[PDB]
Design a protein around this ligand. Sequence first.
Ligand SMILES: Nc1nc2ccc(C(F)(F)F)cc2s1
Ligand SMILES: Nc1nc2ccc(C(F)(F)F)cc2s1
Ligand SMILES: [Mg+2]
Ligand SMILES: [Mg+2]
Lengths: 546, 546
Amino acid sequence: TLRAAVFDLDGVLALPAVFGVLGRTEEALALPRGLLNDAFQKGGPEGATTRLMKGEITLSQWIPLMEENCRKCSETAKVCLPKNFSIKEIFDKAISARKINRPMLQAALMLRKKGFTTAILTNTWLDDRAERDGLAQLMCELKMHFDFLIESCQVGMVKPEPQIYKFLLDTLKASPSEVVFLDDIGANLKPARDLGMVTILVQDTDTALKELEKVTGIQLLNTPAPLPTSCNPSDMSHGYVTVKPRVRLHFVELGSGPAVCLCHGFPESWYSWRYQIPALAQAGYRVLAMDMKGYGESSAPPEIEEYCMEVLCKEMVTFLDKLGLSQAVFIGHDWGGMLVWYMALFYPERVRAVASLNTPFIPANPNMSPLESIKANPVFDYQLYFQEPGVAEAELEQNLSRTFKSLFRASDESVLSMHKVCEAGGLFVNSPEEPSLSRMVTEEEIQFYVQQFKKSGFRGPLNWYRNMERNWKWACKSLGRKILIPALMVTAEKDFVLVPQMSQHMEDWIPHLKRGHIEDCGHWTQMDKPTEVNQILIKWLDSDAR
Amino acid sequence: TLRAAVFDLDGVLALPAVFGVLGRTEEALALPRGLLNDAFQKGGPEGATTRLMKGEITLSQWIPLMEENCRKCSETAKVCLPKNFSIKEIFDKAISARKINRPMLQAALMLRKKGFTTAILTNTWLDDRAERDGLAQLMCELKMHFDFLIESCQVGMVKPEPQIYKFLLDTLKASPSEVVFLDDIGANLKPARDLGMVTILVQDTDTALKELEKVTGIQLLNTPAPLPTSCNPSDMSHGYVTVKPRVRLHFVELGSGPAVCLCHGFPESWYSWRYQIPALAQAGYRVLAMDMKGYGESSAPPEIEEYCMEVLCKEMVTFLDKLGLSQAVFIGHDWGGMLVWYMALFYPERVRAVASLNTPFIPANPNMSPLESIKANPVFDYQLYFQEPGVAEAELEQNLSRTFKSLFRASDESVLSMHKVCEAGGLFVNSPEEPSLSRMVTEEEIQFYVQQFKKSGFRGPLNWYRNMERNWKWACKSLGRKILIPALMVTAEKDFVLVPQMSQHMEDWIPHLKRGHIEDCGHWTQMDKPTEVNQILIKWLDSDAR
Ligand SMILES: Nc1nc2ccc(C(F)(F)F)cc2s1
Ligand SMILES: Nc1nc2ccc(C(F)(F)F)cc2s1
Ligand SMILES: [Mg+2]
Ligand SMILES: [Mg+2]
């Protein structure tokens, strides 16, 4: 029967409420109890505050009216307001102290996840103060999780007027008995209750959620820890830069602040960063999540040499030039990890900081051909399989769904063996026609990759492995250097190819290297352990790139 | 005969040279004359410095080697280095003091403009210092003006070794006698001179340019003031955001720092900001230059109401949400000017600062229908002409080249009369079939607009004028408000429609409004007076949005 859930902002989705700041302010200042609440509410439907809430006046215009109300209330209560008494000051503090009430948000998210339509209905104001960005940020962070945001001051109506509730119902396309409405102010619940909506009077969050759970019959309290926010491709800003006549690079872009360029591995996509992109933007960065050359909406020329590390790096430099960025933080996984270490070594002036997931920095051995070095380690046999043009392409393109569903597996989910792939005749020779779906991914997410790889297939991607010799000669030029910019290496306990021990000598070349390590994490790090990846990157960003 | 010009960076394109910093440092510190230059050059082809210049080691690795060289030189000269003597410190100061030598750049630009191939050939280093961003910025600013940038440390060779000159020639695809090469170091000129290149020994800039002028036969000195840098469409980052199912907005994006959203007028394009986009990025902003809805690569739905101010503004807000920007500075011209004032009034929390070129803020008159208000002023008659769907579209789409070449005219170039357009039967009834080309635009630039308007024509654009009533009712809701965020109004002396006097009462609504005024400037402000527009916007940005 219930299909919709509506939440207030103040005192419900965000805490502490600014009304309670009026209580504590009175106390702090030893003013008459309720004096500030009286001044705030003065004149009722025709007072200063309603005009504010209705969008008639802005916050800055209101401040002096509330001041005057405070004067009038104090005279009649026969007291004096403190020297320095400051409504602007009081409200700036209050409004910056107010934060998202995380458990309420996560309950709203869960209900949306089970198919509820969700909304924020709030009495709020047009905020034109010097410090208004604080609130614009809060509202952005909250509103992206909801179907609708209805603001008294944009619609010209206020709780508890009955018309806003009708406007609510009409926005929801729902009848009153399909809606639960939560509010901390009982007078605002009354009109919902009159039309027969379920209402919840929100005092402490846990009790409200207990009521919310009982009435929707969905578990909201004590639920396991949710994944980070993911990205919907068609809600993102998509960018395109031509780095040379036949080559355009695509990327998705979110956030403001220092530029952070994410570089995926093989055979992946910008979308492999889907759990990091919102979290890093939210953390105060400008994320640029590439399709690396060969992939997705980026160009994919056929020639092998178009994909050697030298050419790929020069092109990432051009990509910064054309966007007008003197630097970016470069963060890479798997092949993209190898690439960002090379960016650090050859273009340190363009790299604000460098991080790699899984891929260690190992200097080229000038005394051993790279092919030889690859044959030394049985777990790289799949790279030799990749050498002969066409062979891996035919197997990997043959059935894309089976391809990604085989590849993208957590460590406990019967990972492909990386072992004696050439001898066996292919990567999938010993895997099912229809693999089961990994816990890491949904069927829809597998189908995004499938549709991406329909544009160019696997030739470009495989070519990243076909420049062993050419990359070795380029790398050899850098053997005298060290990496002395800020650097982070993140190892994954259960990556059985890019093993954590392979990174053990990195401090010889990167003396101030910082590290994170993720346990129980297989090769597909960002979607295996997105929560831990996010925490490790944001902490290193804030300390080293900030 | 001469087809190519090559410039050094230090002492030629950038001043003062870091070598002269070695001179002044010696003097400042009363060290033996030339001691620092000896230490720098110690070991010659096999010393620390050549290894640096060749890319063998990074700047941070070199610093302690130069230190040691300074110690060794001082011992043998039987002196002591100062307490606190600091190579890192000396070079940080020197490298940040170094700036683009503007007259040399503008000469290089001019030669490129007359068809020279131009290049920077420099001995430089891999810069990994904490403060490396300074130089990455310099090099970006310079390199975008040249065909090639050849850096000793990326190519593994140094002036004066003969191989770099051969590598230069081969890059230029030019024979030695077609090249002029300019350098402040005579030993570096010698090998160019050996192959028979024209060389110029650069001491003071003016004499070098005098030589450069004599030998190329092009005027380089005392030339008139050049236009600001323009944008080549196919070198820009192009972005696309879907703000709702049928509507995607396109924009071009350059620079980093606070977001600055440029909103063009009718019937224009992101490209009408072409002279502002590089200058504002260079000034430390992230420019987002829109195709506004109806135009270019943005969607252009047919329905009139899709283009009322309310819908257009909500969509600009969604555009920020999806890009993850809590605010932007909004700068508008003509119709975009009207729109940004509305953004200031209805979404002050999303607008960091607002500026308009030409378009004044005038509050809706609640006592007079807007049509009536438009009929009151003969110079708005062209807006009535625009009302009847199809009529203006047929005239404007009939011949696009004639359309833009008629519209885009400086004040002295027989502007269209805005006068009695309905009576006369059209905007062009009294203009030539083939207008001459305005001084403001090139034939190629007219053809960019023509190709843009081939995608959707004039229906969407004209619809911005077809919501008089609907915009009036929305505006009336804001009549109690003031605009109290940072605001700039820029009037144009010879805009005979959006006249400067029309802005005279703006301080009643925007009490802290700031102003600029541009004399001898017609309606197409950004391309009429791009230099003055750039200076006025950057100054107001740095003081009010920074
Ligand atoms: N630990 C690792 N598992 C895998 C599985 C597949 C591949 C692929 F075939 F895609 F390259 C690389 C690795 S690395
Ligand atoms: N001073 C002014 N000149 C013109 C010329 C044309 C138009 C157009 F037809 F494009 F709307 C508007 C103006 S405003
Ligand atoms: Mg409340
Ligand atoms: Mg020099």
